[PDB]
């Protein structure tokens, strides 16, 4: 576990105003999702058939270390629940049911149902994550996970059950990366709670 990750997580968690600044962006989304007015940290996906829909956080990170919590109820995932980061150019919708995040060079995602990492996924196969998993093996992840973006080292990592799962992706330095997810489940509600950020030393 990196020393800086321990430093970020030992800090008191950021308050509501900071969480709202880093929440889902009602202006940067598929039209098939909306940000809930009574809980602006959560979006709701309309029950549209044969559609995959995403949304980005309001803040695109270009430097520093950042962590946010995703709460995605396990029975609201369906065939394709993907969590990760994207540039501003990543598409936020596809026809059909797809792992939209990680499907091209503009995003990096963890397909929760397959326990596979995708980046430029049309060209590159998925990577088993967590590491313990065999080639045809997946793990049923709990509702909550932490997403850790290190823009200075250029890495994305995850923490599940308080266990750091290691670097999932590298090569992110010099970009401007937003939290993102892609969803397919009718009426799913996914919450994102920014925890903290830490400037490089």
């Amino acid at each position: 576990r990196p020393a800086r990750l321990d430093q970020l997580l030992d800090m008191p968690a950021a308050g509501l105003a900071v969480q709202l600044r880093h929440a889902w962006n009602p202006e940067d989304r598929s039209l098939n999702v909306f940000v809930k007015d009574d809980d602006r940290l959560t979006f709701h996906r309309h029950p549209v058939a044969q559609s995959t829909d995403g949304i980005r956080g309001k803040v695109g990170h270009a430097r520093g270390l950042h962590a946010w919590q995703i709460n995605w109820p396990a029975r609201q995932r369906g065939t394709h629940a993907v969590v990760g980061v994207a540039t501003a150019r990543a598409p936020l919708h596809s026809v059909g049911y797809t792992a939209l995040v990680g499907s091209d060079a503009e995003s990096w995602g963890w397909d929760l149902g397959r326990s596979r990492l995708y980046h430029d996924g049309k060209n590159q196969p998925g990577v088993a994550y967590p590491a313990f998993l065999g080639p045809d093996e997946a793990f049923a992840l709990p509702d909550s996970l932490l997403v850790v973006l290190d823009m200075d080292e250029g890495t994305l990592s995850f923490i599940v059950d308080g266990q750091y799962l290691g670097v999932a992706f590298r090569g992110l330095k010099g970009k401007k990366l937003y939290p993102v997810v892609s969803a397919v489940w009718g009426h799913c509600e996914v919450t994102m709670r920014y925890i903290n950020g830490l400037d490089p030393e």
Binding site: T79, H80, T98, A99, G113, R114, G121, K122, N123, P125, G126
Partner: peptide, 7 residues
């Protein structure tokens, strides 16, 4: 290599 074994 999608969910339905199609790449």
């Amino acid at each position: 290599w999608d969910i339905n074994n199609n790449x």
